[PDB]
Design a protein around this ligand. Structure first.
Ligand code: HEM
Ligand code: FFP
Length: 137
C-alpha cells in the first residue's frame, strides 16, 4: 500500500523523481510555461541539465516526506502551509499540483509494479484540498 510505495520510490529516488516529472511534462506540455529552461529538450537532455536533476530530486524528496507524514493519505495542514508559503511557488495554482498527481497515478498504473495507485490518487486530491485551505489559488 501507500506506505510501502513511499519505501519503493525512495529506494530508486533519482530514477522515479526524473521519470515521474518527465511523465508530468510530456502529458501536460503547457506546464513547461513554468519551466522556460526545459523547452525544446528531449527527456535525455533534460536529465543532463543540472537545475532539472536537482529540482526534480528536491520535489520528490519533499513529496515523499509529505506522503510519509500523512494519515490515511491526508497531508498535515503544516506541510500544506509550507508548500503555499514557498517563494518559488509564487505563480502556482492547485491545478499545477492536480496535474502532477494525475501524471503520477497514470505512471503508477502503467508500471509493472503493485503500487497502490488508488491511494496516490486520494493523496493528490487531499493535498489539493489542503493547499486551497492553506491559501493557494
Ligand atoms: C508535492 C508536490 C511538490 C513539492 C513537494 C514541491 C517541492 C519543491 C521544492 C522543495 C522546491 C525547491 C527546489 C529548489 O529550488 O531547490 C521547489 C521548487 C519549485 N517547484 Fe515545487 N513542489 C511540488 C509541486 C510543484 C509543481 C506541481 C510545480 C509546477 C507545476 C512546481 C514548481 C516549482 C518550481 C517552478 C520551482 C522552482 C523553479 C525551478 O523549477 O527550478 N512545484 N518545489
Ligand atoms: O516541509 C516542507 C519543505 F521544507 C518544503 C516543501 C514542502 C514541505 F512540506
Amino acid at each position: 500500500g501507500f506506505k510501502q510505495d513511499i519505501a519503493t520510490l525512495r529506494g530508486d529516488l533519482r530514477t522515479y523523481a526524473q521519470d515521474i516529472f518527465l511523465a508530468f511534462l510530456n502529458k501536460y506540455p503547457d506546464e513547461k510555461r513554468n519551466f522556460k529552461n526545459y523547452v525544446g529538450k528531449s527527456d535525455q537532455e533534460l536529465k543532463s541539465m543540472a537545475k532539472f536533476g536537482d529540482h526534480t530530486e528536491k520535489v520528490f524528496n519533499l513529496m515523499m516526506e509529505v506522503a510519509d507524514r500523512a494519515t490515511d493519505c491526508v497531508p498535515l495542514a503544516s506541510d500544506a502551509s509550507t508548500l503555499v508559503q514557498m517563494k518559488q511557488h509564487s505563480g502556482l495554482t492547485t491545478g499545477n499540483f492536480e496535474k502532477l498527481f494525475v501524471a503520477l497515478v497514470e505512471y503508477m498504473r502503467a508500471s509493472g509494479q503493485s503500487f497502490d495507485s488508488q491511494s496516490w490518487d486520494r493523496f493528490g486530491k487531499n493535498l489539493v484540498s489542503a493547499l486551497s485551505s492553506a491559501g493557494m489559488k
